[model samples]
Target: CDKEPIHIPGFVQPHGVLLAIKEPELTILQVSNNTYNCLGFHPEELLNQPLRKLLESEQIDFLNDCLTQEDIQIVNPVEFTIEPIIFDGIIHRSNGVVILELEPAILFYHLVKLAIGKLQSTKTVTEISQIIVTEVRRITGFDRVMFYRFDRDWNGIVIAEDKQEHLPSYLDLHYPASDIPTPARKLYSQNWLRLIPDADYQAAAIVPTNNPLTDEPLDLSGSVLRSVSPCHIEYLHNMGVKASMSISIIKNNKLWGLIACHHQTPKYVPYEIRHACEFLGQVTSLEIATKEDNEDSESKIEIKSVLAKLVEYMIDGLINKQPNILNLVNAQGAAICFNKELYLLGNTPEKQDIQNLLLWIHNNIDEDIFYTDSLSQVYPEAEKFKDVASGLIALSISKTQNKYVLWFRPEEVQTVNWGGNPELWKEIVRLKSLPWKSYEVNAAAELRGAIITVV
Candidate 1:
């Protein structure tokens, strides 16, 4: 039966032939050392080798980061859908050596990691806003940005706004729901990310409606494209914005407002870039879901008792001044220390200040509501929480019961001009050419984070 192993040329068989046929487009990479080579070779050659050898020097850093246990790390297998463009010619055929093309896939991948990291860092909504807003601006090269969270009723508030230089303020401004309208909001559902390339370009037009309006379309107020609705244009213009982009912040299959970005001038982001942003958003959503699960589990009776015991075990370490607080915080997303030094451990007790800003909330420590990306400025007693510059915290405490829960989500600069930016809306002209998404979770406290802490 084994007289001879099946001897077949890769060029002849179906699987081999197909691989050879698409040799130019095939990629063979190693996950171990981040080494990789081309895909033309038979499958056996790369069966167990690392995928990093073939990557360009720039791409190796990304490969190394995902695989490494040290830097911006991940635990599970990471998948990424990316369009890698390679040039052809003399380098491969004319010269004696093989040639490959590569670009910075890590920027997109890093952006995703940052988004997920934001979800895991539980300081406060304000802290979380800062993480998201900073990453959004850095990724998009936008000057000023905002994270606009929608209320249950769909009203939008500029919760977090970040800007550079002498930008006009957008704080305290709320946009009405008429801005997105029913049809436009529906369009947002079709694509995960939207980019406006050169907001000044003449927009393509649509056919006019035969139905007459009572007031002759109300003059649409000096904006072009009557069919597209004038309210949108006017809204964008009023914000002094030239371009904008948005990504979803989804949680548990429900819409959780949006992460919005705005530019001061005409800006164009390619379709591939938009998908990269979308991937970042999806990773963010997954991290948020997982972190929520962790937070909920930790708050339960069993985990809470375990955490209390851990804290008790470490109280001696605290009294001895060994600084196990970092270990404790790293192990759990956050902890509420009884009689612990609140200011030293990054907690500011201005419960009354938060109470005033959220007057709509009934004064019950047991009750908790999620408020995102907005801060009350000019509070007369904000000085009480001066130690916490952001004046934002995620907390559930039972003062009567003498127990409290504090979680922190970082805040950032938000966009104020989103509602009036006509040029920010654009069609998603491209999709993620690849089929993988680079996913990550916060360091697992039991294993990964522990290793990091010890190391």
Candidate 2:
């Protein structure tokens, strides 16, 4: 027994020393004016020094109270505010809850700084994906991990990975919308971050109640909170994901993509761990949104410049047709819906006959605008002028075709377009574009894509 108690050779260390450096899994301590540290560090390190001295600099003002185990609602994640003093050199404002401050400059600074941190922390975006995959792996203790991004077509592209050594490359391989349909995307919004700890479990149960005598369905949207979309569960299982955490990546007002953390073996992350992951996701979302905004602005500026040049050329060619001169009605990236529609046209018609066609285009733009197929829907407001208005050109004659460009950016709102039936609009004598409901996301990749530019 005494011989068996002998310590291992140089490869092993004493338990006392190991415990000293092992650091707590979750520790929170005040650093500076309102700023605090919540990393996995020894409590003694925080108790002795102001968080700034340990982390290496001053922090911006923080408006948040130190988070407590009791503060976590458990049912609903709490929002608290605090910035890592290491970046932007400040903690910025912190609300008592977890939602970060909303100052634009602060938001921008946080965005850039956080991204820089992630980049440095992971070495690169490619590497960042790997780190995330690894983190997801450890968090779920999964055997495999895959990172996917969704394009405007609602198709997914596998961009990164960490998995079985023998599995083939899914990178750059695009999957059909069937893999994650629109309804599934819509359903996930109810839970900004959803996790299926056990894939095989028959969903968290739903008991639908009575519909009214008026014949209206229970409007379950407000009544019962359905656990999760069943189709999504089947899809995840098919991918060999035993359990999964799907964090929605929202940019603009759409489901830009998702960071689907999957597990092959049965797993369940504690509420605290899940929230921790959610926090990281929020930080990532803001960074992505900011970067995307910068990119979008630059792209739009360049596109606008190019479009302006083209508009000038069009004006020159149609100059002879003066008085009815072409006008630049709009030049927004998603002006109506990004790259979806453009209206470059001449003076308004006295009878306002082009109203119908113009309205039709607006309606189309309102519902997921894509530039290619938007043109064919054009026809004169009345059959009489159909000949002249049938041209596939971007011009229309309802609004006074003002020379100054009038751009209409697409508003971001997620909703059901029950009235968007082209067939219905075509039949009705009157129609108008309507705004839908507002929504949230796990990460905002779409918002990141909406940065604007005017040059």
Candidate 3:
């Protein structure tokens, strides 16, 4: 069914019930199962009859007002009891058909409130991510709950997870961008939540199959019951999951990530609980943004502090006083070449190697500030001396005269453990020194600008 129009999947999760009604006349064009459980009538009895016969006049008026609004929207769930059972009803219009979704109301609203309260106290983004999966698993009783974060390229990584015992952990596993198509991603942004009660269930088609007003398939982009892609269903089957739910985590009005819940057996989430989960998703987004901003601020402050010390050292070195460029920043070695004079400090390369480095800089680099953790990448001849000057940062003291100061970092190799295959590091790890940070770039710019004016 991959080729089939998934959005018009006419059937909903079996645990909940749905109705398709014609507007103006309020005639019931279609009714799916679970009707007897929600309402006191069977699906057939409700079909072809005016909704006013099944609902109170006040409820009919409510639907009329929703239809007459500025734009068609998903009307919030309204509570109504039918003798022994209570239901939370939701309504929305798509194409020419009006769709109504009904699910049993959950009695534990206060418990959900308490869960959201706990979410607010999380101190970091990691804490927030962990809490989101844990709380969703606790509330929905799913076999697995994963908080998947999207990278700049829209690729997803399982950043945090909560799963039952005996299940394989997916935490830190990367999913390629093709896993979620562009169109589907747009739908997630609009709908915010998706639930599949049973992956193996067959999709029921809408009666008459086409909208009478348009003779086209109903646009179910906003429908909660919209069927999923067959490939995705196969994917769930491969993962041994029978049911799944996704809650979108939006930040800065964009889809940042998702809270994915999976189960081994078919499971239904009531409307009330789903609504609470939606609220929690919104709160989690806010917390994620705040935590990230705070961390960035802290890093900037540390960078600025280091730059302050470097400024003092440069001032002294300019006057031929103590503490030259070598002691200005933390590094394995340092060198200053000014007015055709070269000064070496710490454990740097020999005189001939220094000449080679300076020649390479003059021939290759034109920027006021340039840095690299892998110097050998640019100058293959320098590969033999990688141990002494594998990483280098050079700042141009004079553009016309080729005057400069350079910092050196010896090769400091280390191992990295990735969540996936350990052998992957062979393909990824090429550099041997710490990568340069933006703060270092900024600090170099400041030193170059200040000394250029004085000298």
TM-scores for every candidate against the unseen true structure: 0.38, 0.40, 0.78
Candidate 2: count of backbone clashes, pairs at least 3 residues apart or interchain: 25
Evaluated at residue 332, the lDDT of candidate 3 is 72
Which sequence of candidate numbers ranks them by TM-score, best first? 3, 2, 1
User: How accurate locally, in lDDT, is each candidate?
Assistant: 0.40, 0.38, 0.75
- For model 2, give the 10-residue run with minimal summed lDDT: 13-22
For model 2, state the Cα shift of residue 354 in Å.
34
- Residue-wise C-alpha lDDT for candidate 2, range 41-76, written one tens digit per residue: 443444323333333222212212322235323313
lDDT of 3 at 76: 66
Better of 1 and 3 by TM-score: 3
* TM-score head-to-head 1 vs 2, winner: 2
Quickly count the clashes in candidate 3: 0
Regions of model 1 farther than 4 Å from truth: 1-107, 122-124, 171-173, 205-229, 291-455
